[PDB]
Amino acid sequence: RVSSGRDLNCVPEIADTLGAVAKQGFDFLCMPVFHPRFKREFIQEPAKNRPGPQTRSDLLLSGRDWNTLIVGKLSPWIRPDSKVEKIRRNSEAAMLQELNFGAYLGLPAFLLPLNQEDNTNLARVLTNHIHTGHHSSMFWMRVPLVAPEDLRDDIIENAPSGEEKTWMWWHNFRTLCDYSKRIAVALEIGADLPSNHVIDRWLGEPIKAAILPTSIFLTNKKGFPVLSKMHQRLIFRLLKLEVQFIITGTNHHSEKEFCSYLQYLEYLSQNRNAYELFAKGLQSPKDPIKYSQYQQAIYKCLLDRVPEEEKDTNVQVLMVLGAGRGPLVNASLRAAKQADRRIKLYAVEKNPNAVVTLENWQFEEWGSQVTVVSSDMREWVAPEKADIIVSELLGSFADNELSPECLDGAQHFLKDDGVSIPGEYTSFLAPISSSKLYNEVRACREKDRDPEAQFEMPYVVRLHNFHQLSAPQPCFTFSHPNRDPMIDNNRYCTLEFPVEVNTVLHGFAGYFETVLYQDITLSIRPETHSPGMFSWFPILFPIKQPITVREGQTICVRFWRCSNSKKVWYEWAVTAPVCSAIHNPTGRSYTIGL
């Protein structure tokens, strides 16, 4: 359900306001910690000796009300990036005072206006307050989708980049605040919206609140406020990002008792999938749709391997490499029933903790049809030659987790007429901008290792708070069985991705596509996502220092898959528009061990 709040700059008494506010159903109140007209002097005599209390005392509300029901506001008279020395230094001190009272109160969050082009000083005052032991607070920088210098009316006797610079205000803020997790954006909407190509970027930010003026709401024929469709789409995306919606302004629909504006959010939040339902909650490396497509593939093979009159006499030899707990063996068996064909099966797992489970299956359900091998597929001196080798040694990135080195190792007991399942798989890459995934990468900073090695290692993730810059391109192709002698899985690849708009690059996202057998495909590529398959999430490859890109350029990225008899690893580097150090050289941060 939607969460929402009220932006009141006038608060005569807090229990009166919070009393009537909560009755209208708002979850929280954004209010200022000091009166916004009450200018204060600190450097200048004689005003700095002002008697009396500087604000309403914190005793008026219980500590639970402050920490949950309230959000702060920075006073509008504060221009810490003003050019005038005396207006600046008084404004640095007031901000510390209104923020430290934000700490002393225990407020969950604080609103800070970003509307100027230069906000270098404002960040310093906020960089000095984070490093004070005040972690119970958040900063919601108030930045609009469209600047005030563009939303205005052109009714002046002079003529009235220019659409994206609302973001560059922000990226130059967090970059000055070292991409702190304690800084978020409250995105101020207005009646004029940018193109969707920008919105798709803004949702890559940590949008944590959305400020909705009442002046965008139209009036329907029933007299109730509504949003035109170009807004309702954007709000449907914001709801998916779980932001909190703030109703700024006042009742223009003066008859309707201001709570009507909130009622429509509680309408849109209802009237708008299983991958998002199953997914919830970065990690360093019960899906029957994924196993059925293995089953249908085996069915489509056995009919193709076995003529109809050899059904009773053709002993089809399957080797289920990486059987694990044996779901692929139930499938390999169910296909035979579905195909009505004789199969003999060697289920191979090394892990004794699972051989215990397969061996129990053999005695309870499968019978003598299923052989189990306890030695590993690279050691086992097998007695007979497989007609098929079936497997999921795959990973989120297909050539990860040693599916090739194991299958091409288990190829010396495959018939020359034989096939392999998955027979082909090809991994896919695209650049992504994600300021939230990048901070969740830095959050992995771990003691007793090189503090930048967390960027030289991938992370599995349900990509949710991310923007994608280009259609994914195939990086690495593998087809099994290898029809050739020596030639090696050590591979080199280069990819060039076009770019449309100014945006940071924080990594490249891994997907994959696999041909189990002809016209049967598991896939998590977005443009060809398999239905209802969610076992394999994408992966994230971070980079040491983010890359800020200009439109019209190309992102040229080089990946290597390199290996020896001991280790297997990846290396990756961005070289256009700018050179990024070759990541994970010699497996110093990441390996998938043979």
Partner 1 sequence: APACMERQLEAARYRSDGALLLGASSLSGRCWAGSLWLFKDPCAAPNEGFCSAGVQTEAGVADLTWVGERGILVASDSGAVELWELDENETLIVSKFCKYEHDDIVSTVSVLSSGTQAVSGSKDICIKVWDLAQQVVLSSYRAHAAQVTCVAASPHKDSVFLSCSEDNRILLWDTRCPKPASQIGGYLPTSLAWHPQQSEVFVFGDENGTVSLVDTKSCVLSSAVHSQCVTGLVFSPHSVPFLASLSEDCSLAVLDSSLSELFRSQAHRDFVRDATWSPLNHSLLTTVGWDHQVVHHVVPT
Q: Was 290 annotated as part of a binding site?
A: yes
490 near partner 1 (CB under 8 A): no
Q: Residues touching partner 1: how many (CB under 8 A)?
A: 50
Q: DSSP for 41-79, please give it.
A: -SSSTTGGG--S-SS--GGGS-HHHHHHHEEEE--TT--
- Considering only 20, 47, 218, 230, the residue that binds partner 1 (CB under 8 A) is 47
Please say if 401 is a catalytic residue: yes
Please tell me which residue in 98, 392, 456, 513 is annotated as part of the active site: 392
50 vs 529, beta carbon nearer partner 1: 50
13 near partner 1 (CB under 8 A): yes
Q: What is the DSSP letter of 157?
A: S
Question: How far is the C-alpha of 438 from the C-alpha of 86, rounded, in Å?
Answer: 38
Please tell me which residue in 98, 188, 205, 401 is annotated as part of the active site: 401
52 near partner 1 (CB under 8 A): yes
By the 8 A CB rule, do 252 and 288 touch? no
314 near partner 1 (CB under 8 A): no
- Considering only 3, 25, 42, 55, the residue that binds partner 1 (CB under 8 A) is 55
Long-range Cβ contact pairs of 82-90 (< 8 A, separation 24 or more):
86/43, 86/44, 88/121, 89/42, 89/43, 90/40, 90/41, 90/42, 90/43, 90/44
Question: How far is the C-alpha of 31 from the C-alpha of 246, rounded, in Å?
Answer: 12
Q: DSSP for 255-292, please give it.
A: TS-TTHHHHHHHHHHHH--HHHHH----B----HHHHH
| CA pseudo-torsion sign 454, 455, 459, 461 | positive
75 near partner 1 (CB under 8 A): no
Least distance to partner 1, CB of residue 584, Å: 49
Least distance to partner 1, CB of residue 94, Å: 14
Please say if 392 is a catalytic residue: yes
Least distance to partner 1, CB of residue 454, Å: 43
Q: Was 349 annotated as part of a binding site?
A: yes
Q: Was 377 annotated as part of a binding site?
A: yes
Helix axes 288-305, 327-339, angle to 10 degrees: 40
- Considering only 62, 63, 87, 284, the residue that binds partner 1 (CB under 8 A) is 87
- Considering only 64, 135, 153, 195, the residue that binds partner 1 (CB under 8 A) is 153
CA-to-CA separations, 342 to 88, 325, 487, 512, in angstroms, rounded: 85, 23, 36, 33
- Considering only 133, 135, 155, 308, the residue that binds partner 1 (CB under 8 A) is 155
Measured between its terminal Cα atoms, the distance across the chain in Å is 48
Kindly list the residues in this chain that would bind partner 1 in the complex (CB under 8 A).
9-13, 35-39, 41, 44, 46-47, 50, 52-57, 60, 76, 79, 82-84, 86-87, 115, 147-149, 151-158, 213-215, 248-252, 254
Which amino acids are annotated as binding site, given as ranges?
Answer: 290-291, 349, 376-377, 392, 401
Q: Just list the catalytic residues.
A: 392, 401
